[PDB]
Design an enzyme around this catalytic site. Structure first.
Site, PDB file in Angstrom:
ATOM      1  CG  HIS A 132      46.761  41.102  34.911  1.00 56.74           C
ATOM      2  ND1 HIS A 132      45.419  40.835  35.123  1.00 56.74           N
ATOM      3  CD2 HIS A 132      47.441  40.108  35.516  1.00 56.74           C
ATOM      4  CE1 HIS A 132      45.299  39.737  35.842  1.00 56.74           C
ATOM      5  NE2 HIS A 132      46.520  39.276  36.094  1.00 56.74           N
TER       6      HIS A 132
ATOM      7  CB  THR B 137      38.636  39.755  29.246  1.00 58.17           C
ATOM      8  OG1 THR B 137      39.048  40.333  30.473  1.00 58.17           O
ATOM      9  CG2 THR B 137      37.137  39.614  29.120  1.00 58.17           C
ATOM     10  CB  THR B 138      43.591  38.266  31.434  1.00 59.57           C
ATOM     11  OG1 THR B 138      43.363  37.307  32.463  1.00 59.57           O
ATOM     12  CG2 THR B 138      43.058  39.622  31.825  1.00 59.57           C
TER      13      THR B 138
ATOM     14  CG  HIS C 102      39.486  45.324  32.610  1.00 59.27           C
ATOM     15  ND1 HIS C 102      40.534  44.527  32.240  1.00 59.27           N
ATOM     16  CD2 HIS C 102      38.621  44.513  33.242  1.00 59.27           C
ATOM     17  CE1 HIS C 102      40.297  43.280  32.643  1.00 59.27           C
ATOM     18  NE2 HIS C 102      39.125  43.243  33.277  1.00 59.27           N
TER      19      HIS C 102
ATOM     20  CG  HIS D   6      35.227  42.482  34.800  1.00 57.90           C
ATOM     21  ND1 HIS D   6      36.237  42.280  33.875  1.00 57.90           N
ATOM     22  CD2 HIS D   6      34.180  43.040  34.143  1.00 57.90           C
ATOM     23  CE1 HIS D   6      35.811  42.739  32.714  1.00 57.90           C
ATOM     24  NE2 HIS D   6      34.554  43.194  32.829  1.00 57.90           N
TER      25      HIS D   6
ATOM     26  CD  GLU E  76      38.502  43.556  29.666  1.00 57.49           C
ATOM     27  OE1 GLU E  76      37.907  42.685  30.312  1.00 57.49           O
ATOM     28  OE2 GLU E  76      39.670  43.445  29.267  1.00 57.49           O
TER      29      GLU E  76
ATOM     30  CG  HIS F 123      39.537  42.336  37.917  1.00 54.32           C
ATOM     31  ND1 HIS F 123      38.985  41.082  38.077  1.00 54.32           N
ATOM     32  CD2 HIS F 123      39.372  42.639  36.613  1.00 54.32           C
ATOM     33  CE1 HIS F 123      38.544  40.656  36.904  1.00 54.32           C
ATOM     34  NE2 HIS F 123      38.746  41.608  35.992  1.00 54.32           N
TER      35      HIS F 123
HETATM   36  C1  LIG Z   1      42.266  35.920  37.776  1.00 57.72           C
HETATM   37  C2  LIG Z   1      41.692  35.234  36.479  1.00 57.72           C
HETATM   38  C3  LIG Z   1      42.203  35.900  35.206  1.00 57.72           C
HETATM   39  C4  LIG Z   1      41.671  37.283  34.993  1.00 57.72           C
HETATM   40  C5  LIG Z   1      40.177  37.120  34.857  1.00 57.72           C
HETATM   41  O1  LIG Z   1      39.590  38.435  34.479  1.00 57.72           O
HETATM   42  S1  LIG Z   1      38.207  38.604  33.800  1.00 57.72           S
HETATM   43  N1  LIG Z   1      38.426  39.953  33.151  1.00 57.72           N
HETATM   44  O2  LIG Z   1      38.038  37.547  32.818  1.00 57.72           O
HETATM   45  O3  LIG Z   1      37.212  38.570  34.872  1.00 57.72           O
HETATM   46  C6  LIG Z   1      39.629  36.597  36.202  1.00 57.72           C
HETATM   47  C7  LIG Z   1      40.251  35.336  36.551  1.00 57.72           C
HETATM   48  C8  LIG Z   1      39.496  34.207  36.907  1.00 57.72           C
HETATM   49  C9  LIG Z   1      39.997  32.886  37.264  1.00 57.72           C
HETATM   50  C10 LIG Z   1      41.488  32.915  37.575  1.00 57.72           C
HETATM   51  C11 LIG Z   1      42.138  33.686  36.438  1.00 57.72           C
HETATM   52  C12 LIG Z   1      43.627  33.533  36.324  1.00 57.72           C
HETATM   53  C13 LIG Z   1      44.168  32.102  36.576  1.00 57.72           C
HETATM   54  C14 LIG Z   1      43.465  31.354  37.751  1.00 57.72           C
HETATM   55  C15 LIG Z   1      43.959  31.912  39.097  1.00 57.72           C
HETATM   56  C16 LIG Z   1      43.583  29.930  37.850  1.00 57.72           C
HETATM   57  O4  LIG Z   1      44.621  29.308  37.585  1.00 57.72           O
HETATM   58  C17 LIG Z   1      42.448  29.348  38.446  1.00 57.72           C
HETATM   59  C18 LIG Z   1      41.458  30.494  38.590  1.00 57.72           C
HETATM   60  C19 LIG Z   1      41.999  31.466  37.542  1.00 57.72           C
HETATM   61 ZN   LIG Z   2      38.156  41.644  34.066  1.00 62.30          ZN
END
Ligand SMILES: C[C@]12CC[C@H](OS(N)(=O)=O)CC1=CC[C@@H]1[C@@H]2CC[C@]2(C)C(=O)CC[C@@H]12
Ligand SMILES: [Zn+2]
Length: 257
Positions: A61, A195-196, A93, A116, A103, A91
């Site tokens: 993604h 945002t995901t 977008h 971000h 975003e 990362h």
């Molecule tokens: C990687 C992701 C999703 C994409 C987000 O992007 S954004 N655009 O909101 O900054 C940043 C982010 C933060 C925490 C991370 C989560 C996915 C699921 C994870 C790994 C967990 O299970 C615990 C921490 C979680």
């Molecule tokens: Zn992001």
């Protein structure tokens, strides 16, 4: 399963993640004339001198650069925050063309891309616990416009051919994220979400007013990435942005007049 396409994109996410229709979803449009200057907001403290980058990863993604978050080496403090937030990863977008990709929007303007830098609150001990808390994460957002090259981005650009497809990773040590920051730390802030998926409502957003400039050649390398795994039908990793969500009962605050 989720993605950015017609059949699995943002308008579908609420089926697996009902908080997609919640009260504090991100991103949002930043209406610059409605954002309240808050003279009580502190300067943002960005302490990245001891950052330890580890890996660069295509997660299907985005791509991310991951840091050692086992100690307070690269931390965000001050601004709207209470306590200390460790840098986990950054990362981006971006769009298929320069007129979309961000975003957040600013008076409905879309930038070519958005960076971000994801941080988590050390009072919760690990990022998995932090995502379950309303003040668990702080994401620093930086807009990218296309013009002059950003020299501090080139090391990232040059390794993307090695992580073209999903789950591919490479060593990415000694990368200094200070080289991605604009001059000004003037910001907008509001309470929001990832945002995901899982779209958890755990983020204090800090969006810098000043964009960085990147070259057309730099963003064209982002657009050569693939959403697909190796050997699967090739689908360019472009337009990996969630559109603006309803502001609902929230105030965007400005650190500047
Ligand atoms: C990687 C992701 C999703 C994409 C987000 O992007 S954004 N655009 O909101 O900054 C940043 C982010 C933060 C925490 C991370 C989560 C996915 C699921 C994870 C790994 C967990 O299970 C615990 C921490 C979680
Ligand atoms: Zn992001």
């Amino acid at each position: 399963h989720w993605g950015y396409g017609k059949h699995n994109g943002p308008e579908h996410w609420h089926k697996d993640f009902p908080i997609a229709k919640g009260e504090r979803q991100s991103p949002v449009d930043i209406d610059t004339h409605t954002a309240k200057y808050d003279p009580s907001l502190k300067p943002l403290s960005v302490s990245y001198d001891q950052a330890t980058s580890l890996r660069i990863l295509n997660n299907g993604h985005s791509f991310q650069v991951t840091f050692d978050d086992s100690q307070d080496k690269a931390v965000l403090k001050g601004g709207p925050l209470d306590g200390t937030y460790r840098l986990l990863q950054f990362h981006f977008h971006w769009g298929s063309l320069d007129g979309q990709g961000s975003e957040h929007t600013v008076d409905k303007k879309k930038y070519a891309a958005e960076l971000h830098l994801v941080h988590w609150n050390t009072k919760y001990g690990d990022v998995g616990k932090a995502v379950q808390q309303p003040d668990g994460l702080a994401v620093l957002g930086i807009f990218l416009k296309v013009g002059s090259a950003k020299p501090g981005l080139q090391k990232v650009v040059d390794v993307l051919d090695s992580i073209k497809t999903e789950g591919k990773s490479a060593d990415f040590t000694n990368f200094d994220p200070r080289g991605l920051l604009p001059e000004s730390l003037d910001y907008w802030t509001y309470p929001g979400s990832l945002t995901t998926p899982p779209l958890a409502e755990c983020v204090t957003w800090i969006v810098l007013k000043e964009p960085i400039s990147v070259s057309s050649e730099q963003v064209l390398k982002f657009r050569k990435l693939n959403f697909n795994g190796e050997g699967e039908p090739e689908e360019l990793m472009v337009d990996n942005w969630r559109p603006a969500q309803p502001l609902k009962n929230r105030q965007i605050k400005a650190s500047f007049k």
